[PDB]
Design a protein around this ligand. Structure first.
Ligand code: DUP
Ligand code: DUP
Ligand code: DUP
Ligand code: MG
Ligand code: MG
Ligand code: MG
Lengths: 113, 113, 113
């Protein structure tokens, strides 16, 4: 397992930490949502949670990443939920296919139930 | 009407407050976006706004929630904008179908026009 | 080029800064993702990044905006990545078709590589 501290940012001012596919995968529109492996695991830094979002160059190529929430205390593998929009999409091993955004986790008194 | 203070978090470290459907609803891909009732209303805590996002177990089952912005001063009912991706999806009353994330509302000098 | 300081908020408590299409554009579902021009450019205020999200009245009319990340130091034109969901969608010049949300940019020690 690899922690999110192993992820890289494309540039200093990049909001997102890039997530790469660990598998070669072909996706077609009739397959609907697929969960792609990253080999990266939570959890996240204190007082933060994560959002997985598409990379724009990838979205424009017809692979939709559904926005996903990563909980602060998730310790499982971060997966990318993805769907081929219109056409056949081929993901290669190591391709940067999404990005992780870190956001402040606001405390509230909502019941934890 | 029920305020967002009535929502619950799945776990202490869960970023999202779960939103449940108040109706049994069937959705098909040809129907396109539908707005599901929650019986939960704004507004939000001071200096925050909301994002409605999908729950991953729900997205993976073929129901797409379109990300939606909840304004700090919205006092209407929070609705979930949803679409069946490929297949027929049946939502039952009380099913947790999305989640509300709270985020800091940044002040800017943009004209309010 | 116009900076994001030229954007307007619908109301004082609106989280989003509205983005308008500068072109008349027709979109069909078979066209897949299209990048709509706004004539608005980064960069963003210090310590912030942006998210482009749909407006709910627009999403409900069948035009999906794919959530997009605007980096703090992006100096290019902000484009809206959009797709007609089920039907033919006609965007007119000046129509508010998405919104820009500003969010705090969290610093981490991830390699910038
Ligand atoms: O894109 C995603 C979304 C979620 N996840 C993981 C991390 C997150 O903390 C965990 C739970 O996410 P959600 O709350 O969105 N899913 P759901 O509500 O279906 O499961 P749970 O009841 O555990 O909260 O799933 C991913 O790996 N990728
Ligand atoms: O998923 C959503 C998105 C928005 N909303 C409500 C809350 C939000 O404050 C209100 C307005 O949202 P948008 O600005 O996204 N919609 P639009 O720009 O079409 O309407 P307005 O001109 O009032 O801002 O709609 C929901 O209930 N669910
Ligand atoms: O909806 C969007 C998304 C991104 N963008 C622009 C701004 C953002 O800073 C820039 C890069 O975005 P991403 O990182 O999402 N794209 P990608 O990873 O494909 O390109 P790069 O390798 O440059 O980061 O693209 C838009 O104009 N609209
Ligand atoms: Mg990028
Ligand atoms: Mg959950
Ligand atoms: Mg609006």
């Amino acid at each position: 397992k690899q922690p999110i501290s192993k992820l890289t940012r494309a540039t200093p001012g990049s909001a997102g930490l890039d997530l790469c596919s660990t598998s070669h995968t072909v996706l077609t529109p009739e397959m609907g949502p697929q969960a792609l492996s990253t080999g990266i695991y939570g959890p996240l830094p204190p007082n933060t949670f994560g959002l997985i979002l598409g990379r724009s160059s990838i979205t424009m190529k017809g692979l939709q990443v559904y926005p996903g929430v990563i909980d602060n205390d998730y310790t499982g593998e971060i997966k990318i939920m993805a769907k081929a929009v219109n056409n056949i999409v081929t993901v290669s091993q190591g391709n940067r296919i999404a990005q992780l955004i870190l956001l402040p986790l606001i405390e509230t008194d909502n019941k934890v139930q």
